Amino acid sequence: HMRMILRKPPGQRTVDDLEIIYDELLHIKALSHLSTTVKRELAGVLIFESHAKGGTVLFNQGEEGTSWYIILKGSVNVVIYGKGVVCTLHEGDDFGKLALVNDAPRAASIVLREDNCHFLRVDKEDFNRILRDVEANTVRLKEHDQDVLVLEKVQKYTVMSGTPEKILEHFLETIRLEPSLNEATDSVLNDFVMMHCVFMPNTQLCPALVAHYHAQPSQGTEQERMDYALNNKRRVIRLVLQWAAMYGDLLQEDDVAMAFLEEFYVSVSDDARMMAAFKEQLPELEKIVKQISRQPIRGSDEVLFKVYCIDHTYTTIRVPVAASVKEVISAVADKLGSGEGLIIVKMNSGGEKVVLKSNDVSVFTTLTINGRLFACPREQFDSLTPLPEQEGPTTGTVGTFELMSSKDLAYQMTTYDWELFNCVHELELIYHTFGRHNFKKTTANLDLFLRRFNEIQFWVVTEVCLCSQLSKRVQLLKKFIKIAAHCKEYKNLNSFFAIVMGLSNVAVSRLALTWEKLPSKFKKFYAEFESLMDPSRNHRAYRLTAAKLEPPLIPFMPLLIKDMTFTHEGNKTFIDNLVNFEKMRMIANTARTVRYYRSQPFNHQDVRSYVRQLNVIDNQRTLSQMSHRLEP
């Protein structure tokens, strides 16, 4: 009797039909966490389904989701192409929710395990008005009695955690090839495409992509199977194009990624020939393949680097930019023909020494502005002393840049800053945060740009301290405040903050007789600049200033690096051995922020030459001593 009642259409059930159904819905496990209001609505919506023979398909992978199911009697298999029965649901369990809520294809097929199975069903329009914003149940996808993908309402269900394999699988299935959804699709894939190197490197991704590209459906009529296979191949190509774009010129640093792409293009063009498909995607794939076989520094680029000995003689080694400290030692011991146990130390102009680890990569650009690289046995470590080269200039350069326009200088600084900022690849921020050695990739471009901040800062301090005439020193402080203001006008907030921080340096802020007789207009100009650095409410002053501006702008770099650091250190990469994709999205968002700042372009040869070839003292001790004899 109940069967017949539950088999009647929603708008054909009596008041006494509805009343009997509700009394039975109270026994059902899947519906326990629901309100009376909801259960009463479901009473006039739940459809009774029955199938007699095991092996009967309930729905197929790739199909659009039209129903949510609850198992009353029997069991079903969750089946995925190229993996088979991936898990099995029993009486009490529910399925098919994820596709309904995310308006996405079915990630799997549901097949009756045993004979005579009974189901309760709720169709999409009925599900959405009644259940959509009440069923908050975390969607766990399982394989081999193990959580393999976890999704939540952060409205769609977003990936919180999962295995590298299932995350890729998920982001493949949800690609929309429909041409008006071009940028929406690319935006969804962007998180994975950018972050994959952390949890799923190319040595794993590339084989997994090939495996997916050739995955055939294990069910359906010939046409059904051909249509699915073709769109699967279309989705794989789409992801490959996003992956290849993200890397760009960086692919040349990875042999496995280049081998994959070169083979993948052959595999696709062959499929395109005989299936008459991929009309638009094949030229895109060919464009990217042919391009393979200040300028951005590559990790494979060659460096002539001087490595210094204790007696201040040196070897010039010829190695790749991304060479490890171990590769450096080997190159030095080659020319010095040694087996005397060399270690590599980097040293300040101040004399501060650091022993580098054997597996540290691309250390050449991680040196301080006036830092040098040394090779010695461990018993020599403490006796190392700096080179004169490291101590910087002794006479200033005011007689040159004072003759130059404040506006001209600021502009030429921002031009140089932009060339440096555009050399920095989005992935270099990822490698820098998660640790260079884990990727064995270079961050040389980022290193040189971050260095520029310290350079500009110390340039200010140098010129002031080498300026003995109090009258001209006031003209210096005035000019630096002017250059900073102009820098802030071009939206170069990096060079702006660097100059302001140069002016607030212990050695400069000391000079009361210089600050006192500085025009009162500029005194307040600087105090406003110095209050933009206020670290209060998480650098609220700067953050609001930067947010109000429009795309073509250079951000305050140390704060970006700080954000990145705390995102990594305050969040765990793995949660229960599943990739914490919530953390990956955060890191990606911070990187997309850089993408936003460079989304628009930017709008005197002797001024170009000076700005680009700065000579700076980075020895704070020396800078204090000079300051102490200008004004005791």
Binding site: F453, N538, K562, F566, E569, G570, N571, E582
Partner: protein, 150 residues
């Protein structure tokens, strides 16, 4: 309103302590880009200014020192270097502030792992002193209680 500053060499555990104090690792996700990221309430409001990640930019350190009112000088008991580096930071605080004395506390982080310990316990007492651990939640809050008292 209070402004405390965490100082020390890299790999000393500065960031771990700061997050462990303001919020806590794992239990909640940590967003360092919103307003209340470094601000807690204890009966008063504290903002932790940490030089973690920004060690190469010593202008950042100076700005935090200038705006600071309390100072945590964190060293790691795993590495000898990190304790020595505290001599200079101790001096540098006085230079930026232009004062005789400033409310500060010494911290010997990573005290949980003692099969790698290369630093004695009484060395810090000669130079407020605590021997904390961020990942084991030892003394994490105690550190920042000290500074508000002083």
């Amino acid at each position: 309103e209070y402004k405390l500053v965490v100082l020390g060499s890299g790999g000393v555990g500065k960031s771990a302590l700061t997050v462990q104090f303001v919020q806590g690792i794992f239990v909640e996700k940590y967003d360092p880009t919103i307003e209340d990221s470094y601000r807690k309430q204890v009966q008063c409001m504290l903002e932790i200014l940490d030089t973690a990640g920004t060690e190469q930019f010593t202008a950042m350190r100076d700005l935090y020192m200038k705006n600071g009112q309390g100072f945590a000088l964190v060293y790691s008991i795993t590495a000898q270097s990190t304790f020595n580096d505290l001599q200079d930071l101790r001096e540098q605080i006085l230079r930026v502030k232009d004062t005789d004395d400033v409310p500060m506390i010494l911290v010997g982080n990573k005290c949980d792992l003692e099969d790698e310990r290369v630093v004695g316990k009484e060395q810090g007492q000669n130079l407020a002193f605590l021997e904390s651990s961020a990942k084991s939640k030892i003394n994490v809050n105690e550190i920042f209680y000290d500074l508000v008292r002083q």
